[PDB]
Scaffold this active site. Structure first.
Site, PDB file in Angstrom:
ATOM      1  N   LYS A 101      -5.345   9.224   4.755  1.00 16.79           N
ATOM      2  CA  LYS A 101      -4.122   8.440   4.898  1.00 16.79           C
ATOM      3  C   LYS A 101      -3.421   8.746   6.212  1.00 16.79           C
ATOM      4  CE  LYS A 101      -1.192   7.353   1.772  1.00 16.79           C
ATOM      5  NZ  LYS A 101      -0.207   7.422   0.658  1.00 16.79           N
ATOM      6  N   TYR A 123       1.624  14.562   6.202  1.00 12.01           N
ATOM      7  CA  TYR A 123       0.468  15.142   6.878  1.00 12.01           C
ATOM      8  C   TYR A 123       0.848  15.597   8.281  1.00 12.01           C
ATOM      9  CZ  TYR A 123      -2.645  13.330   3.232  1.00 12.01           C
ATOM     10  OH  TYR A 123      -3.282  13.068   2.037  1.00 12.01           O
TER      11      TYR A 123
END
Ligand SMILES: NC(=O)c1ccc[n+]([C@@H]2O[C@H](COP(=O)([O-])OP(=O)(O)OC[C@H]3O[C@@H](n4cnc5c(N)ncnc54)[C@H](OP(=O)(O)O)[C@@H]3O)[C@@H](O)[C@H]2O)c1
Ligand SMILES: NC(=O)c1ccc[n+]([C@@H]2O[C@H](COP(=O)([O-])OP(=O)(O)OC[C@H]3O[C@@H](n4cnc5c(N)ncnc54)[C@H](OP(=O)(O)O)[C@@H]3O)[C@@H](O)[C@H]2O)c1
Ligand SMILES: C/C(C=O)=C\CC/C(C)=C/C=O
Ligand SMILES: C/C(C=O)=C\CC/C(C)=C/C=O
EC number: 1.3.1.122
Lengths: 365, 365
Positions: free
Chosen positions: B123, B155
């Site tokens: 992602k 992230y």
């Protein structure tokens, strides 16, 4: 064995996109089964670049049986046969004749023959002629355990001969089904990299943009290919490793790519603008765009001092058009992996690798 | 170092879909860097199946800093940290605090800490919230060199904390971006295999057909995934091999598959009929048809003597719904290959292997 070689290879189709790689890879000291003695068979007389190779070249028309027996039967020392050729048409019986004549000429005479590698392709999974009705091709990712389609495919005939002749005699076999081959051979009937490089070279020569003539699907779909040197590694592997003996094996780079990303690299390697797929635009035959363009190539070969090739010889624009209207044709490499074959290629780098090599061999720079 | 171990691992998220694999792979004598001592962390009290493992379990809410200091700072022997967890939501800061509190607790106290593996995902290449208008994600095949999208993604926060804290101290690092994880954990928030198996188990229980509720595209498109054990192998690799240190690395099985072929194997393994995608039919929320169905699962767990799991705990039908409206999300493993990592899985065999394993642990049948 011979002189003091460990293995003696007979590459049938040595001027081919894969045969040329075998003509290099086999002669390496790192190559398994080495040191290798290599016989190279092609129909044409030996070109300049193959004369610089440590390969006993043999000019023979394999479709001609008597000629084949005359030239191959003296070769008593052959250990491994790498049939990496085809007649140039999908004619089943003429292709079979060639393969038969190889086995008919070598098997009785080669007292220490062990293995026969037969190279086919992924077309064994989706070949169809009289399009417009029935017979549905297999779905991808293609696996070797997939049954044959109810159609005439010379791959079938070749396997049949292979299975039988290597059965009547204590011989091992291996069928290789490579994907789209990224190679460097200028005398292949299907070299996609050389074809696109030629188109690129001409676009640059006329100061025009590198225009993508393919379809919307082929521009965005996942596609797979295989480096010719890897097919050499994969065939040599099956030739010496007991794990790969008597097995049908696919052969790709292990990864996937998209033509939209390849097309950009092609333009970047040539330093020109590119025109990718235009939304709504339909596919244009590159074979039509490059018809009546041979004189331009003749001029380029002179001006750039390239190795003398004719446009019909080094470029198959019809073959690009097919690839540019193809989607969902990815094959699986799990079988070879699970059998121990750890060979792979970054397909993007492999493409540039082939461009650089054809530049080094003066086919294109 | 400790007792007679060469390496001491701190697996953060041990009950997770990957953390549970690490709880098995690390304790093997074949595993590189062995013999391994393993600390395992999760918020829930230790499950029965994890109690049967040679892993020091630590019940700690990592979102709580003081609690994290209290339970992790006395672990002076930690050599490698495997952060394989997340808060459960897309909350950037709340996810960050966790990763912070781990490093804030261990780094000053672990005098022989060497490496920190950070697991994120794919992602990183397509995270979007206001997906109604602008901002365009990356195109596949996803590569590690692809820049971050102008979108809030935790992230990013994790990498930033990773890069900085491993920089202030003399620690190596590795970012792991696995594809769809084929695993066996019954307490993961995103276990695609357990989810579909649970759905299959219910369809079987009610004598109904295994009906594919997804979209046309996700039925036919190429998809990729990764075995949890492989992710464990891939993170262990990046923790002991200098070639993989300080590198961003994707992680998939090395091949591609299709859900249409997975769906057939799922029906075959459960021995029931199945209804594939119907032309014209549109996607139906698997979460909706599996809502008000937890009563049936409580009964099934009893009757089949399965390990006590609540339906919402072992299955994420919303996550399956997402997977069934997705395509063009294939990543590349060329970087790990070229660095020397030769780990792979047949995705088809991996999927069955995950069904088999969950049956062995009595999560299913
Ligand atoms: N090309 C691809 O991208 C590709 C990809 C996947 C699979 N395949 C399959 O792999 C197989 C091998 O084809 P290829 O692409 O390697 O062929 P290629 O590169 O075009 O070369 C064919 C070779 O066969 C020789 N040959 C042809 N007819 C002959 C005859 N009558 N007598 C003696 N030699 C003859 C040619 O020598 P001359 O130069 O003297 O003709 C040439 O060296 C084919 O079945 C093909 O379908 C090809
Ligand atoms: N799942 C997939 O298919 C998949 C695929 C690709 C990438 N990823 C990514 O990989 C990363 C790892 O996720 P995952 O799939 O491994 O997660 P998971 O399997 O759902 O497990 C998450 C783990 O984190 C622990 N945890 C959660 N909140 C906690 C807290 N406050 N304190 C302590 N422990 C806590 C959980 O233990 P408890 O049971 O105690 O909560 C659980 O063991 C995620 O960023 C995810 O996006 C996941
Ligand atoms: C089918 C295709 C593009 O459509 C490329 C493969 C061509 C070949 C030689 C397949 C193997 O017989
Ligand atoms: C996006 C998708 C199906 O659409 C599967 C990937 C799910 C995960 C956890 C990706 C890593 O962040």
């Amino acid at each position: 064995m011979a002189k003091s070689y460990k293995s003696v290879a007979l590459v049938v189709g040595v001027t081919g996109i894969v045969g040329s790689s075998l003509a290099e890879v086999l002669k390496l000291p790192d190559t398994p089964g080495g040191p290798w003695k290599v016989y190279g068979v092609a129909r044409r007389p030996c070109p300049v670049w193959l004369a610089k190779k440590p390969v006993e070249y043999i000019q023979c028309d394999v479709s001609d049986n008597q000629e084949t027996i005359s030239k191959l039967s003296p070769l008593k020392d052959i250990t491994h046969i790498f049939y990496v050729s085809w007649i140039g048409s999908e004619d089943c019986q003429t292709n079979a004749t060639m393969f038969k004549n190889i086995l008919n000429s070598v098997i009785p005479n080669a007292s220490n023959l062990q293995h026969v590698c037969l190279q086919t392709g992924i077309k064994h999974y989706f070949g169809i002629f009289e399009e417009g009705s029935k017979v549905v091709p297999h779905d991808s990712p293609f696996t070797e355990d997939l049954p044959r389609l109810n159609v005439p495919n010379f791959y079938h005939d070749l396997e049949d001969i292979l299975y039988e002749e290597t059965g009547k005699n204590n011989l091992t076999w291996s069928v290789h089904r490579p994907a789209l081959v990224f190679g460097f051979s200028p005398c292949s009937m299907m070299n996609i990299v050389s074809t696109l490089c030629v188109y690129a070279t001409i676009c640059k020569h006329e100061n025009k943009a590198l225009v993508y003539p393919g379809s919307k699907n082929s521009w965005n779909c996942y596609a797979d290919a295989v480096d010719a040197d890897l097919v050499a590694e994969h065939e040599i592997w099956a030739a010496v490793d007991p794990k790969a003996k008597n097995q049908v094996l696919n052969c790709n780079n292990g990864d996937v790519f998209k033509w939209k990303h390849i097309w950009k690299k092609l333009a970047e390697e040539f330093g020109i603008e590119m025109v990718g797929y235009v939304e709504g635009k339909e596919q244009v035959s590159l074979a039509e765009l490059m018809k009546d363009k041979d004189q331009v190539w003749d001029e380029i070969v002179k001006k750039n001092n390239l190795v003398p090739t004719k446009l019909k010889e080094i470029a198959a624009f019809w073959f690009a058009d097919i690839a540019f209207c193809s989607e969902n044709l990815i094959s699986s490499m799990n079988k070879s992996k699970e059998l121990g074959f750890l060979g792979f290629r970054n397909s993007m780098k492999s493409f540039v690798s082939c461009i650089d090599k054809m530049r080094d061999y003066r086919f294109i720079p």
